Amino acid sequence: YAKKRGWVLGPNNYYSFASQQQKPEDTTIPSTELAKQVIEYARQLEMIV
């Protein structure tokens, strides 16, 4: 376990390290492409089918 993995037995414990993230969000990255759906909605609805 000390060589295939880490988990070095120091002072009387196997020690874990950081296993987390930041979770960023923009939610206006879709604002280019959600506009592409809305233009497509009025596209097919206005065309003589």
Partner 1 sequence: IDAFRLINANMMVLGHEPRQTTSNLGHLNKPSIQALIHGLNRHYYSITINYRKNELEQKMLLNLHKKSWMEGLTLQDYSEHCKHNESVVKEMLELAKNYNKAVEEEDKMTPEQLAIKNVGKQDPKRHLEEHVDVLMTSNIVQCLAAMLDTVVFK
> Can residue 39 be called a binding residue for partner 1 (CB under 8 A)?
yes
Residue 40 touches partner 1, criterion: CB under 8 A:
no
The amino acid occupying position 4 is K
Handedness of CA 36, 41, 42, 43 (dihedral sign): positive
Rule CB under 8 A: is residue 47 a binding residue for partner 1? Answer: no
Residues near 7 by beta carbon (within 8 Å), at least 6 away in sequence:
1, 14, 15
Q: Give 2 or 42: the residue with its C-beta nearer to partner 1.
A: 42
Q: Applying CB under 8 A, which residues contact partner 1?
A: 28, 31-32, 34-35, 38-39, 41-42, 45
